[PDB]
Design a protein around this ligand. Structure first.
Ligand SMILES: CCCCCCCC/C=C/CCCCCC(=O)OC[C@H](O)CO
Ligand SMILES: CCCCCCCC/C=C\CCCCCC(=O)OC[C@H](O)CO
Ligand SMILES: CCCCCCCC/C=C\CCCCCC(=O)OC[C@H](O)CO
Ligand SMILES: CCCCCCCC/C=C\CCCCCC(=O)OC[C@H](O)CO
Ligand SMILES: CCCCCCCC/C=C\CCCCCC(=O)OC[C@H](O)CO
Ligand SMILES: CCCCCCCC/C=C\CCCCCC(=O)OC[C@H](O)CO
Ligand SMILES: CCCCCCCC/C=C\CCCCCC(=O)OC[C@H](O)CO
Ligand SMILES: CCCCCCCC/C=C\CCCCCC(=O)OC[C@H](O)CO
Length: 200
């Protein structure tokens, strides 16, 4: 019973459109700018990195808080954790709040992973940072770091319930990047260059 309530809590906390609450206070509706989605990436597009970092933290806490309750109440080997983390990420991407669409969900997914293993989350972040500084594609770093988190969980000996959670979350994030992949492979993906470092 408490397990079903935690999975529902994870879906509803993960549903919260923090990006939209913060964008509206700055006069912006995120459905009418950039990707049309609510998340740290589209908040960064509309409002810049100061607001982006705040929404990244908040979206991270959407994955972090239910998964930490599941780890502490049920355990790393509980399928309760599996469905709590999946609920947070599907609630972010496809919220109960009809008429909104979540962003690709890297921040929310990272919060889930950090609740399971802070070491895995930091190493996944370091992989992201390495690829980003090398190639200057955001999408390439995110896709590669998402697979890396799965590999680190596998090599570290996390059980099948955790690897199942990681593979499905990973698969959903790669699916949300499908056009980035098509652009990367056809030389159409925008790189993070001097004007992107500087003007905004
Ligand atoms: C490009 C090729 C480079 C070669 C790649 C080899 C990778 C092999 C992994 C070794 C694991 C060593 C121990 C990993 C860290 C570890 O055990 O955890 C730390 C703490 O938990 C947090 O700092
Ligand atoms: C800039 C935005 C990004 C935000 C990123 C940093 C967020 C740090 C939050 C909480 C730390 C509390 C420590 C939690 C410890 C934790 O996860 O413990 C699980 C067990 O280790 C699993 O068994
Ligand atoms: C390179 C492999 C890194 C695996 C890794 O980060 O493992 C963390 C701890 O060994 C368990 O949480
Ligand atoms: C344990 C490890 C913790 C990890 C700490 C990570 C902190 C990330 C900081 C900012 C995110 C800003 C929001 C993302 C912006 C973004 O992806 O922008 C691409 C767009 O293409 C822009 O046009
Ligand atoms: C299976 C779950 C694993 C999931 C763990 C993810 C890896 C963590 C890496 C970096 C965090 C900072 C990322 C900052 C850039 C960012 O938010 O990028 C958005 C999209 O890639 C834009 O297209
Ligand atoms: C990124 C490559 C994708 C391919 C991975 C290759 C290496 C790791 C293999 C398996 C982990 C399995 C974790 C998922 C377990 C799975 O499918 O769950 C069935 C249930 O356990 C039935 O009860
Ligand atoms: C740790 C992560 C493990 C990952 C496990 C497997 C991941 C692959 C699954 C889905 C990708 C979806 C791709 C859908 C293909 C598709 O619809 O193609 C459209 C074009 O690429 C342009 O729209
Ligand atoms: C071991 C089990 C491996 C299961 C991996 C992926 C399936 C679930 C996520 C795939 C993402 C995907 O294709 O999603 C479609 C769209 O959501 C349609 O709207």
């Amino acid at each position: 019973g408490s397990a079903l309530f935690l999975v529902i809590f994870a879906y509803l906390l993960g549903s919260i459109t923090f990006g939209e609450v913060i964008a509206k206070l700055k006069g912006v509706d995120l459905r009418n700018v950039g990707s049309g989605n609510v998340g740290a990436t589209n908040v960064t597009r509309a409002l810049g990195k100061k607001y982006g970092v705040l929404v990244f933290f908040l979206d991270f806490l959407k994955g972090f808080i239910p998964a930490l309750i599941a780890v502490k109440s049920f355990g790393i080997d509980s399928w309760v954790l599996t469905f709590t983390g999946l609920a947070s990420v599907l609630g972010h991407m496809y919220p109960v709040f009809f008429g909104f669409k979540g962003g690709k969900g890297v921040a929310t997914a990272l919060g889930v992973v950090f609740a399971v293993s802070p070491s895995v989350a930091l190493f996944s972040f370091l992989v992201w940072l390495g690829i980003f500084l090398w190639k200057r594609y955001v999408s390439l770093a995110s896709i590669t770091a998402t697979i890396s988190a799965f590999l680190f969980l596998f090599v570290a000996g996390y059980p099948v319930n955790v690897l199942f959670m990681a593979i499905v979350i990973g698969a959903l994030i790669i699916y949300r990047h499908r056009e980035n992949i098509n652009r990367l492979l056809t030389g159409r993906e925008h790189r993070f260059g001097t004007l992107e470092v500087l003007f905004q």
